[PDB]
Design a protein around this ligand. Sequence first.
Ligand SMILES: [Zn+2]
Ligand SMILES: [Zn+2]
Ligand SMILES: [Zn+2]
Ligand SMILES: [Zn+2]
Ligand SMILES: [Zn+2]
Ligand SMILES: [Zn+2]
Ligand SMILES: [Zn+2]
Ligand SMILES: [Zn+2]
Lengths: 458, 458, 458, 458
Amino acid sequence: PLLIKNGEIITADSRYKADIYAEGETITRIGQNLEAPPGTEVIDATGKYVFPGFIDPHVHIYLPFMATFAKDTHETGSKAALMGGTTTYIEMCCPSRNDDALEGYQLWKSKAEGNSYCDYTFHMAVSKFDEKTEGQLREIVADGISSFKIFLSYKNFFGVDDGEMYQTLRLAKELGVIVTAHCENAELVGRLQQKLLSEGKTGPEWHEPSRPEAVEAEGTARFATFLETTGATGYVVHLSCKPALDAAMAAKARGVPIYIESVIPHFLLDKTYAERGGVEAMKYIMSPPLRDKRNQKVLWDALAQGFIDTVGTDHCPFDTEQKLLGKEAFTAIPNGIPAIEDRVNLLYTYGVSRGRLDIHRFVDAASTKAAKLFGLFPRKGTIAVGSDADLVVYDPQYRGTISVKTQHVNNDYNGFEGFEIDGRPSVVTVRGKVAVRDGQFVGEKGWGKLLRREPMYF
Amino acid sequence: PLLIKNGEIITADSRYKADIYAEGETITRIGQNLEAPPGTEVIDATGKYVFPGFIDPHVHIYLPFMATFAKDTHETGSKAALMGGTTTYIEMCCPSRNDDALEGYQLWKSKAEGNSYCDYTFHMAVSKFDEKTEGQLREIVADGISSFKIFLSYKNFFGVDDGEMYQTLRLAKELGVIVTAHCENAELVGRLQQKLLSEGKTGPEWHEPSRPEAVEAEGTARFATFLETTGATGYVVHLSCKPALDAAMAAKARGVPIYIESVIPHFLLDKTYAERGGVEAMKYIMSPPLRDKRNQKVLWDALAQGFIDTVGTDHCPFDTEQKLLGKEAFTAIPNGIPAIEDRVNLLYTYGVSRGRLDIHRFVDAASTKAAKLFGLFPRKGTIAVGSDADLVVYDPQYRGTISVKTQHVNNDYNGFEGFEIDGRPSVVTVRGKVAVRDGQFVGEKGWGKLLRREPMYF
Amino acid sequence: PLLIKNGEIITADSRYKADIYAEGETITRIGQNLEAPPGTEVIDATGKYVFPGFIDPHVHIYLPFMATFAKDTHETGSKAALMGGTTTYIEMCCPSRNDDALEGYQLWKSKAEGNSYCDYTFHMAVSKFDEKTEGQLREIVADGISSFKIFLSYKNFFGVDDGEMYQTLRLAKELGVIVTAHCENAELVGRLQQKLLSEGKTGPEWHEPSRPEAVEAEGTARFATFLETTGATGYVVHLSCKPALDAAMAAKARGVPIYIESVIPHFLLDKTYAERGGVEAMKYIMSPPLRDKRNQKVLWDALAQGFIDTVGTDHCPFDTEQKLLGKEAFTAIPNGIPAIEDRVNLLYTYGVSRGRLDIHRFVDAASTKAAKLFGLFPRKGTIAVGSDADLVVYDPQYRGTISVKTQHVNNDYNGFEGFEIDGRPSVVTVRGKVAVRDGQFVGEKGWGKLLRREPMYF
Amino acid sequence: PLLIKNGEIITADSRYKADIYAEGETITRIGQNLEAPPGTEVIDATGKYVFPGFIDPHVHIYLPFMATFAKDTHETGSKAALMGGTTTYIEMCCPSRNDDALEGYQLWKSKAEGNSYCDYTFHMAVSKFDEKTEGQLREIVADGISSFKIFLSYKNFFGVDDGEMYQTLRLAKELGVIVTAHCENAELVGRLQQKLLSEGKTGPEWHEPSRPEAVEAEGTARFATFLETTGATGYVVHLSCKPALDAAMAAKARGVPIYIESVIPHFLLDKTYAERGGVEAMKYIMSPPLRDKRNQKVLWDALAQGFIDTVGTDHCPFDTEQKLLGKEAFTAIPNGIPAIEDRVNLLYTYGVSRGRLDIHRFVDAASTKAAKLFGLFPRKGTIAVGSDADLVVYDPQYRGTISVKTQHVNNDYNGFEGFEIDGRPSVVTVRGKVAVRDGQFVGEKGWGKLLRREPMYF
Ligand SMILES: [Zn+2]
Ligand SMILES: [Zn+2]
Ligand SMILES: [Zn+2]
Ligand SMILES: [Zn+2]
Ligand SMILES: [Zn+2]
Ligand SMILES: [Zn+2]
Ligand SMILES: [Zn+2]
Ligand SMILES: [Zn+2]
């Protein structure tokens, strides 16, 4: 049994002081001065906030990509997540066009079993479409995976054409599945990459120009048009700039059931980081690229007003050594930045503590909204009787800086090296069991379970 | 003591089954199978929803307007509200340009004391600005009223000019007050009214053309520009059409702290109702006017995505006899439609039950958001330990129709006569005390209190 | 020699009364009371307007399409054009994906030689892209054809994919060629067509729903993105609705060198014509489909302000008998409406005479702009010394109605049967030679020549 | 008699080589190898362009403003205009609120008689509205002035309120007059000015912040709303930024008869010039203020596509000594920059020679469009038989720089000091009489006449 007392509870739509008692894995009751049976583990949350466990709807743990593999394992990844306050993560299951989808799903699925410290689930990538695949997708959905993922980029590896996208969306609508999508243009990026390389422009500073804002805007609008035409519900992952936001907003305004996600690096980093040259710049190469800083205000304002629904990380860790695989051509630099451990602290600091982000909008954008969209709610995403006891006792008096020297991500650099944070998790629990106590990791291996969802977007 | 058991609790960010125990006026604890001391009043909510008491941020009880007076009293008005599921209402305190603001405030304030069945508070109208008035506004704010109200229409009676609007906004920013605003154009409406009358166009069907969508759009954009320039936080009341929504959305997108409210009649009624001729058409005359029905989809879609923040009624009851005061000229028809009693059932029915409105967005738009914006939260607007026990046991199995024959509004007609509803309040409580039991009004006169707020928008 | 005297000359940027003297094929001099050598043919234009010969930048004479062939020949087509005041037309050379481009060009080219009454030129369609084709396109451009044409629809027959579109645009930029484009989405239209048919919806009234406005908007925006990314100059053919106009305007506003064309049927006809059922409805089936009439005001306003650059017809004549080829499924109805003969009179009547279209904007939209965009200017498109003596003595006192009974188009129905017109050509000349005198056709077979252009958009 | 031979004639819709013969004040005939009677003055235009005399629709010669007077006289002003290629200018007749409108008109009118080297006309400012004024405006219009001018700024001196603006527009519609307007917000500018001064911010660098882009956008949109509501035709003077352009474009798109003008300094100068401090910065203080340079591309692109209709100067010359009148407070710096003499060369150089501005669009934006809008066409604005012989033989081989040392404007500084130009007028004529020959001024005092217009916008 667990009892968290004297803490100020804050959810997306409530704020109060009371005690939380969890007999087992779920919250049993809430009230003031609760009496917990003897033996109950008591946590004193005096002077601290008690938030629902945070949820990252977009991470990469196991990933064979751009000639190599992402650095975290479900073990190191889930641990880093917990240290950061994230108690549930949704990983992108990404088998390529040449892989068997069902086999890919089972591979990712088995790599996670007994290896995760916190709960998780997947987004099933659809990198090709045919009779064989349709049958396997029906099976994967039936196993509890209620979300797909398509890419409008990465030609021949992940990208699907209009015909495949259309079929994926019709199937999704039939199964009540929500489709997440990476929006760019596979053809344009490929052509622009070749053009720049043939011109001798090989440095990391040509990554952004090879896939400008106009391309993300085109893909975002195309995706919205297919959703509107098929009747399927969609979700745009890591939207990074105004032109794309305008396209997604226009779709929302005319009634298209589409949702928007932005990832932490696009709120705090900008294109100049990728113009520093050398391995230093390679550390900030991702897709969509970091943009002109003028976009940060746009994203922050949109987040405050709820135009942007969720905030994820698109966590994709690589070692500087791996980044150097593209010292000859920027097209060979493995795309990705690590952030699964810093999302919450960064969002809280620069959004709530030093920004205009309302604290309730913060909880909604970093936990509740994602739980709702992907069928994890009310099990996850909030604090209420019946919900899983995934809690985060947050300390707002803490002051420090982020550094690779103190991170738990299995790679050699931190994207936010030196950034200050005005808070951090003091205690983190997973289904009633303490995983982090006073900055000390005390999690239990294999405690995390796979969360199965029910389709709801017909 | 009160105990509501076996009900499905639904708030903006939670959904579960548990019992709610309120020892006194606030919720003491929540859990499953709670044991209430003997003597506790037990309500069985089996098979029913338990929502937070709903809040109407825009009503008119006492109102000397257009040569006459609104029909409801705080007694009949609060009763009608409760029957409909609304446990808190914010009334527009409206002294005209020729009245002393402080006296006006005190008049409204005393008419409500001991006469309301549920809690309430006010929006202080600023229909002129000068040294004398500034001093009185500071006093009214200090008395707990944290919101102003200005009109960009009704020349010489309620309307303020750019100079006055600017000063009102600067003062609001200084005091941390949020400014609500009726957005049209006092001059244009006056001119267009005169033009139409001089042309012999006197029927009710000329009301809409006298203040077209372009006018509301102009006023909405003007208001946004003054907010952006003064640094004040604003709130647009009863936004009725796309052009205006576009203007308010553009302001939101560029960072202006502005919020949007729409009232129920603009979601379900349209301009043709005011083109029926005679007293029948006069029943549907209000400002802003009912619009072309193409606007209803726009508003519904915007509500579903959270673009529109709150839903109110702009409740302004008049008898058909009073409406006839303008049988000679439409300009003399007292503007207003009654709706304080039907808002919740209408929104639930056409939004949740038969529409695309998510049930959590429904609670937020009809209760929580308004509580947050006007400083009533967390006291009101949600279900959580510490909050006032304002609850609504809602019956989703109920089926019926709205009719003046069964309303409690103190006038002779219902704007939604004949409309079907797929639910209704079964039990309604105010701070732990039952006011409505099984469709029977059992409220206590004078139980309602004035809610004082703290300024928060500096 | 030719002398047109006492006429009021009206061009896009001039208006005056004077005489025009053409010694041979071009205008020799302009002035008042000019003395023409003896033998000169004198035309008295007293009380009439003298416009530059009008130009239709989008017609179909020879066209193997949808299992059949368009009805006009270069002989009947050029004659009908002249009777209507059009002295130059640009035909779409359309070999399909299975045809050899160079052979296709030569086929169209030889069908026109010695068979046209007026001058003409072509837009070279690129329905596929490969090494073989690139070489042939370079040859065709070198032969004087400075414009391409790509289709974003008609899968497997005319439509090109993103890869092919990109390559076509890069080549166009290299050669200084302007690319015209039909903007929809080949995949979406195909899928939506199949869906409707499988649902038993086979009538002509399902044509519009099979390719809604959202699709044209998507293709228009996609095209604009590829122009912006490749640096090529583009031109959107027959833009029919607001969503598409918005997309093209956004591109214009941000600096993309893109131009807009709209065709006469979209200004005067609407979707209901295709909902009349039977062969009557089949007469109004075209692509993009006739739209909701709310779009006509949008197009007219855009034309008046110069947002829409040119007005063409997309003349594609078919007999009702041929239209019946799709009595079983709307997908088999040959798309197209005839209009080459009525464009000028219709535009003049409903635009200038009865609309808000300025007479100079009329000349620019129906003649000069197209001549400029496609390199026919200053040879064609205006009245000035040195220009070809292609003139139209227009009679503004004429009043009549359009009817198939008096048309010269080689088919059995007129799309504007019964429409009134407030003017008509009295005299029409081609390079100094009279082709139409007092409504009598006196043209000379084979007089028309192929106009070769110089590339100018690098 | 005048004969200009061997020149390449370029108008907005024609380009050719021929001779122009003017027997008297108007062009008599055009053709190749024309024979002029003996005594005819012959100008050889070999290797040069022959443009229509350029027209500046917005200048200030006589102006009592901000405690002082503008430096040019109709003598020095018209001379400077001619040297620059401008043969017709429209001056803003600006009596303030305290002046009698009719007297003001007559004052301006008499100051110009016999004192202008080239033709001219006026825009009648309406700085207040009442019965007395309406009567005088009817008289002024009857005297040939077909355009009004209202200011939405300069409180109590020039600015009119909504009531006055509405009445001015209704009268304009009745008389068929077009209304030009300076769009900002009198109240907001006044308040923001006071706020900044009270904060000790007195330097020239606070001018822009005192009237930000949001204000011009608000005024532009307000003006458009009143035009749309009254049915009057409008024209926005010196539009300087994207937000305002967006507002004016939206109005154009929905059918409002509104036109846009931008002045040369907003295309080439930016806000930093006014941040140089001291008298140097004061030289660049005008209204609307110079903006962030990001706006220059927007304006250039809009001009190339015809979104911006005309290009003027808003010529308002002051001596540095006069500028110093506001060394204590920026609000006292007389607003204005000189440019009447450099407009054409600057537009030609940076638009045509070094930009993307098409040469025909150049002639239209600098001459023809303005002539059309203000009823000067076809008398002025083009080259054609019957038109006034106002011609400009332009030399495209000339290369030089602009300097106060060689200007003819009656003040001590040039706003474009040091700017390079790729052309200049070689010969300039006014109604058949040479005013400038090979850079030498040979004009005749009092030759210029007042141009009376006919109302056309009912
Ligand atoms: Zn991605
Ligand atoms: Zn990813
Ligand atoms: Zn109101
Ligand atoms: Zn109201
Ligand atoms: Zn086509
Ligand atoms: Zn076509
Ligand atoms: Zn001005
Ligand atoms: Zn001016």
